Design a protein around this ligand. Structure first.
Ligand SMILES: [Zn+2]
Length: 318
């Protein structure tokens, strides 16, 4: 209950910092740091002692000691005076941002086409189950934006997203429901294009109530009319109106957007910012929180489709 823990600024992808303890009224000869990874968690713990003083008990921390695993780390400090008595100083948290892949699916059906959409949109149910089982077999934690803050608090975080709200997405629910067990708790996000709800080949209101009632799905916005936002300025109908339509259906808060076609620019982000906490793109790559401005409205996603080999799929979620 005494003092405060500070550290040296680092960049998002850095592996090292020097953290030091400050503002103690009593005078100490050394400080002991008890540090552990929130995910692993307290049972895994490592102690480092800074006999180093004059420089506020600086400690050079490098993730190599933690095997370069990343995320949130907890720090407990205890001060040892000239008399060898011990005093509990303060608890802190330091975070080293972790990469999170976000997979973009669309239809979970065998291609019947052309019909609705191109072949690239249609992952057969068997392929999708193989992906989901792989995440089950390799200890992935599936997250949605209600749990955004946990990416640095869990092992192997991953977001599984689906765009458009196509009716064959109920096959995805069943696939997830059947893999649901005491060990594996699945979560996914569905982005509805609002004005297509209860249209042919789109999820029904009952479809959504079911997906919502399983505890697996987060229901979010895909715009009202699958509009390309960089080329539109009807923000009100497409951003705000879409959100309120879904919200009036679900009864749950809508906080995330997925730009149709991946189309966006600065004015559309500034307008998205007014109505959403997160927005997701089709920009290729993993997501990392780098500290960039508005970066939570430009989240990078991976395209997964019928021609995605398992080997490549695996390379994506590495
Ligand atoms: Zn779409």
């Amino acid at each position: 209950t005494q003092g405060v823990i500070t550290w040296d600024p680092y960049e998002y992808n850095a592996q090292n910092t020097t953290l030091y303890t400050k503002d103690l009224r009593d005078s100490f000869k050394e400080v002991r740091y008890n540090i552990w990874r929130t995910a692993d968690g307290p049972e895994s713990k490592q102690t480092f002692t800074s006999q180093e003083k004059d420089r506020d008990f600086a400690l050079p921390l490098h993730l190599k000691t933690f095997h370069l695993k990343r995320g949130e780390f907890q720090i407990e400090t205890v001060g040892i005076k000239e008399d060898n008595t011990e005093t509990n100083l303060v608890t802190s948290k330091i975070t080293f941002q972790q990469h999170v892949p976000v997979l973009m699916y669309h239809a979970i059906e065998k291609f019947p086409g052309p019909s609705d959409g191109d072949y690239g949109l249609y992952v057969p149910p068997e392929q999708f189950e193989k992906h989901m089982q792989y995440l089950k077999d390799n200890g992935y934690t599936m997250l949605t934006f209600e749990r955004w803050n946990d990416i640095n608090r869990v092992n192997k975080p991953i977001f599984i997203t689906m765009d458009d709200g196509r009716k064959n997405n109920m096959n995805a629910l069943h696939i997830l429901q059947k893999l649901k067990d005491d060990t594996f708790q699945p979560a996914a996000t569905e982005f509805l294009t609002a004005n297509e709800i209860d249209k042919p080949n789109r999820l029904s209101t009952d479809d959504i109530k079911q997906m919502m009632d399983s505890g697996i799905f987060s229901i979010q916005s895909h715009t009202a009319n699958h509009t390309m936002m960089a080329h539109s300025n009807n923000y009100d109908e497409e951003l705000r109106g879409s959100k309120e339509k879904i919200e009036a259906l679900t009864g749950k808060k809508v906080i995330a957007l997925a730009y149709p076609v991946g189309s966006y620019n600065d004015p559309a982000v500034e307008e998205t910012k007014k109505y959403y906490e997160f927005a997701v793109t089709t920009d290729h790559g993993n997501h990392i929180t780098k500290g960039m401005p508005n970066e939570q409205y430009l989240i990078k996603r991976h395209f997964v489709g019928p021609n995605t080999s398992m080997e490549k799929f695996i390379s994506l979620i590495k």
